[PDB]
Amino acid sequence: DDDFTAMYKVLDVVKAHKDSWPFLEPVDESYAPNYYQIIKAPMDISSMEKKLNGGLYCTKEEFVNDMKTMFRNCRKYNGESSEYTKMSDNLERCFHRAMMKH
Amino acid sequence: DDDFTAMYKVLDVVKAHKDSWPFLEPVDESYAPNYYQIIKAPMDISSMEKKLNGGLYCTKEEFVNDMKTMFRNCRKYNGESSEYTKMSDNLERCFHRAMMKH
Amino acid sequence: DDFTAMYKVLDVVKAHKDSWPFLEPVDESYAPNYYQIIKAPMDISSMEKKLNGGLYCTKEEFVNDMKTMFRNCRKYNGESSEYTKMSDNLERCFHRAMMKH
Amino acid sequence: DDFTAMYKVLDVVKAHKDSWPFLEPVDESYAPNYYQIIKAPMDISSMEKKLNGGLYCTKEEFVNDMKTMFRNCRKYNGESSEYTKMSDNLERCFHRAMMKH
Ligand SMILES: C=CCn1cc(C(=O)N(C)C2CCN([C@@H](C)c3ccccc3)CC2)c2cc(C)[nH]c2c1=O
Ligand SMILES: C=CCn1cc(C(=O)N(C)C2CCN([C@@H](C)c3ccccc3)CC2)c2cc(C)[nH]c2c1=O
Ligand SMILES: C=CCn1cc(C(=O)N(C)C2CCN([C@@H](C)c3ccccc3)CC2)c2cc(C)[nH]c2c1=O
Ligand SMILES: C=CCn1cc(C(=O)N(C)C2CCN([C@@H](C)c3ccccc3)CC2)c2cc(C)[nH]c2c1=O
Secondary structure (H helix, E strand, C coil), rough: CHHHHHHHHHHHHHHHCCCHHCCCCCCCCCCCCHHHCCCCCCCCHHHHEEEEEEECCHHHHHHHHHHHHHHHHHHHHCCCCCCHHHHHHHHHHHHHHHHHHH | HHHHHHHHHHHHHHHHHHHHHHHHHCCCCCCCCCCHCCCCCCHHHHHHHHHHHHCCCCCCCHHHHHHHHHHHHHHHCCCCCCCHHHHHHHHHHHHHHHHCCC | HHHHHHHHHHHHHCCCCCHHHHCCCCCCCCCCCHHHHHCCCHHHHHHHHHHHHHCCCHHHHHHHHHHHHHHHHHHHHHCCCCCHHHHHHHHHHHHHHHHHC | CCCHHHHHHHHHHHCCCCCHHHHCCCCCCCCCCHHHHHCCCCCHHHHHHHCCCCCCCCHHHHHHHHHHHHHHHHHHHCCCCCHHHHHHHHHHHHHHHHCCC
């Protein structure tokens, strides 16, 4: 198969994970005060989906980088001890297994 | 062929233009004295890139308004006869061509 | 020339489906004591930095860093590892590209 | 087109009185552990090689390499270094040239 199909299958697996729900859409600032003042490059699963379906991921590289940002942003904003960060770790290990499979 | 994909393609075209380089990042005040005191709403290509990839442009209207602001700030601070203003007219024309294509 | 050739070859390698574990320096949280075991770590981003920094005088000097990158994988993960299968895939791709460019 | 502009800019930059420390990759004998500290080394000769090799599609990557050059200087030598004064001068020079060409 090809890189598109692989990335599509990976996102589907990631979205299905029990802890994906905080990462599905862009962060609502009413739930997270000054998120966009703190986070310079916001990233979420729906934006990755938009880029993928829009033919904007030429290679797996820029896909991994966006994933890397989504998790970096979580850690940065919520802290290492946050419940969101535990979920982020779980989702990261999920993204990793999926990459290895697809 | 989606608002997101269209805006992504447009920004890429704009960044590639010969005169985009002074609009790529937020204005360095060391090159433009008291820029931030004069300009109430600063805007640049990297900020718009971050807004787009963050899922913050619901419609093209939102995007056009930021672009309008970016060029308004240039004319305001540098004046009609400035070399920056010639560049900002060229880039505005570039923004327009891209919006018609994508 | 050699410069442009080395440039095109890294691009081909990065584009390969199995390049993603070789793109950045190894995260020790995924590979315990990697840096204690591997004495000369190498990754695609590091070679890109050397290339762009004018640190590759020869084509050979560059080919040795690539070779080290695959050697390190085999050494650390073993012959039967899933990483080694991807390393093999990335290696012949590298070779195919070197012959074309 | 963008080529000619970037070529003229580099020529102007190379001609500047303070360009000489930035012309070639850093000699580690003058700067101890430079390559251990600086992860992305950049210099004018490397930028010339990329330009002449057709690796700058747009002015954007060219500006980014220039930004790296100066970032490296500041990082390694500090804000109060004589090299950093030279770096500021060369940056002002890069800027005038970019406006002209
Ligand atoms: C870790 C991922 C990024 N991230 C997402 C947050 C976030 O967005 N949330 C928790 C919710 C807000 C409401 N939404 C809507 C769409 C929804 C969906 C289903 C049921 C109720 C509400 C879901 C995500 C959030 C909130 C803080 C304080 N920090 C963060 C944060 O870092
Ligand atoms: C193959 C050669 C180099 N090599 C890389 C490893 C490695 O580092 N990885 C596989 C991951 C680490 C985390 N990153 C992040 C950004 C990521 C990417 C995609 C999904 C989740 C997380 C990607 C590569 C790794 C782990 C072992 C046990 N041996 C190795 C190893 O020999
Ligand atoms: C600022 C730019 C990058 N940068 C270059 C250095 C550097 O390499 N130099 C200054 C010289 C070394 C030898 N060469 C030769 C060609 C030469 C030229 C003229 C007289 C003698 C030798 C020129 C660059 C250097 C040294 C420190 C402590 N930090 C740096 C450093 O940050
Ligand atoms: C045009 C729109 C916004 N705008 C940006 C300016 C600005 O910031 N610049 C032109 C530079 C500053 C330094 N950077 C670096 C990375 C650079 C790039 C190329 C060569 C040298 C240095 C690029 C933008 C600037 C300066 C005045 C007097 N008015 C303005 C101004 O209205």
